[PDB]
Amino acid sequence: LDGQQNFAIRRYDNNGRALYDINLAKMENPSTVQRGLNGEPIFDPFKGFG
Amino acid sequence: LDGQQNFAIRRYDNNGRALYDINLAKMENPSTVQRGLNGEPIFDPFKGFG
């Protein structure tokens, strides 16, 4: 089934227009968030997440 | 000479009393700073460096 089926959770904007995919099977070298000194992830509204 | 000599750069407080030693040869599992999204290292005056 792995080499036969494809699944994801795509994000859509408020108008219902799709934005991006998030497909774990197609995710090549994924990453976790850079957490601060209190476990709070590093994030800028524009640059994104660390 | 690596197995015969030991060198470091020790940090002293304002009165001149030693605090710690940074010996690279004896440094077991060293680490680099966690930089933010602008390259600024994450640091708290009390918790230390990330």
B-chain residue closest to A39, CA distance: B50
Alpha-carbon torsion, ordered A30, A35, A41, A47, to 10 deg = -60
CA distance B29 to A47: 31
Closest partner residue to A50 (CB to CB) among B37, B44, B48 is: B37
Resolution (A): 2.7
- Do the Cβ atoms of B47 and B40 come closer than 8 Å? no
Experimental method: X-ray
Six-digit token string for A18: 């799709």
Transcribe B25-50 into DSSP letters. TT-SS-----B-SSSPBPEETTTEE-
| Polymer length in residues for chain A | 50
CA distance B23 to B10: 8
Number of H helices, E strands in chain A: 0, 4
Contacts of A36 in chain B (CB under 8 A): 42, 50
CA distance A29 to B6: 41
B47 close to A (CB below 8 A): yes
Six-digit token string for A44: 């800028």
